[PDB]
């Protein structure tokens, strides 16, 4: 069947990294830059394989944030993709359940960014919309990230996380702006 | 001989985590709290083993910082320890060389905190004192971390890192203060 392996970036072979880049480009329909690839590296990769062949991926990146004024360790989930011909068979769900187990063993909180349609998969494995305010650094000072509110979901490993509290994010750059649409 | 394995926190067994806690407490001479242990978890552990037995460790934690106003991905090295009876045989050095290879495959910059005596080991494997200013968040705003300047060393994976530039750190809490000594 499908076999799942969880590997840190440092544990990947060159072959596996090239196959990951291929899966990401194709699965994101060519909207996937060198910075987006760099942005996926440095943490854990949960990967699905059909015999030797990479067919699914999600990354978990460690981030260090503040919940109101208290430090909180975050596992930040990104770059979820399943090869188009392998979709709608539960691989995405399995990737997320493995991801939840990593978060539970390692971090206080899981966070991710999803579109409205995108959210159902995550919600089926326990994720919930973050209700509180979000803040990001802009030219060295915190400013509320209205854009992103409602698009961020979380998953509670540390039972004392208030999803209505304010999160103050670490800097990850990647053009941040508030959309205004008439 | 000594065998080296690099494992993410999520890949450790319960036995291995308990042995890691034991090594850390003993190797840090009982100055090692639950928060200090939590602070070591969530990234990579480079570990040295004598047959089945854990004898050395160092952790690499992903951090996301700003170099002046540009994002920089950091591998933050912490919790280096070798069992006292195994010291002065090159295990510490080997742990650091494995650590440097992780940094080179994953991050733009390695950073760590060392005492004056502590620095020689790191300097023997290419690390250098960060010369620029350091900034940390305090009640939500950046303030210069004078305390820490001179105690932080870096190791350049991304050849365009200016060690005289200002680093703006992510929040990791753990009582921050400037010492004043007469
Ligand atoms: C999002 C994505 C990873 C989902 O992967 P997947 O393997 O198809 O996910 P799953 O199969 O677990 O779940 C997908 C859907 O198939 C349905 N499904 C899963 N297994 C099934 C089975 N045996 N029979 C019928 N339906 C099934 C699920 O019900 C889920 O429901 P939905 O139609 O209501 O959305 C995939 O569509 C993808 O790679 N998209 C492009 C990249 C992307 O947008 N990624 C997210 C970035 S945040
Ligand atoms: C710091 C520490 C990890 C070093 O581990 P180690 O395995 O002894 O390190 P190494 O053997 O690679 O290097 C240590 C010294 O032994 C010397 N040495 C290494 N191999 C040798 C050999 N075969 N023969 C003689 N000397 C040797 C090295 O020259 C180095 O030089 P130094 O005396 O000038 O400092 C260890 O002392 C320790 O665990 N300390 C307590 C925890 C701590 O303070 N950690 C750092 C937190 S930032």
Curated annotation (Swiss-Prot), chains A, B:
On whether Lipid metabolism is a keyword of this UniProt record, the answer is no
In terms of Pfam families, this protein maps to: Acetyltransf_9 (PF13527)
Organism, per UniProt? Providencia stuartii
Residue sites binding substrate per the record: 31, 78-79, 113, 147-148
PROSITE patterns per the UniProt record, alphabetical: GNAT (PS51186)
**EC top class, in one word?**
transferase
Taxonomic lineage = Bacteria, Pseudomonadati, Pseudomonadota, Gammaproteobacteria, Enterobacterales
- Could you give the subunit structure recorded for this chain? Homodimer.
| The protein's name in its UniProt record | Aminoglycoside 2'-N-acetyltransferase
């Amino acid at each position: 069947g499908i076999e799942y392996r969880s590997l840190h970036t440092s544990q990947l072979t060159l072959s596996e990294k090239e196959a990951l880049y291929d899966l990401l480009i194709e699965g994101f329909e060519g909207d996937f830059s060198h910075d987006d690839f760099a942005h996926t590296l440095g943490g854990m990769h949960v990967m699905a394989f059909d015999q030797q062949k990479l067919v699914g991926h999600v990354a978990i990146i460690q981030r260090h944030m503040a919940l109101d004024n208290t430090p909180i360790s975050v596992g930040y989930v990104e770059a979820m993709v399943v090869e188009q011909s392998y979709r709608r068979q539960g691989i995405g769900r399995q990737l997320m359940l493995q991801t939840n187990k990593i978060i539970a063993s390692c971090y206080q909180l899981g966070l991710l960014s999803a579109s409205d349609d995108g959210q159902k998969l995550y919600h089926s494995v326990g994720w919930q919309i973050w209700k509180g305010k979000l803040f990001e650094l802009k030219q060295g000072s915190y400013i509320r990230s209205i854009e992103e509110e409602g698009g961020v979901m979380g998953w509670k490993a540390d039972g004392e996380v208030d999803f209505t509290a304010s999160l103050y994010c670490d800097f990850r750059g990647g053009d941040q702006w508030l959309e205004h649409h008439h």
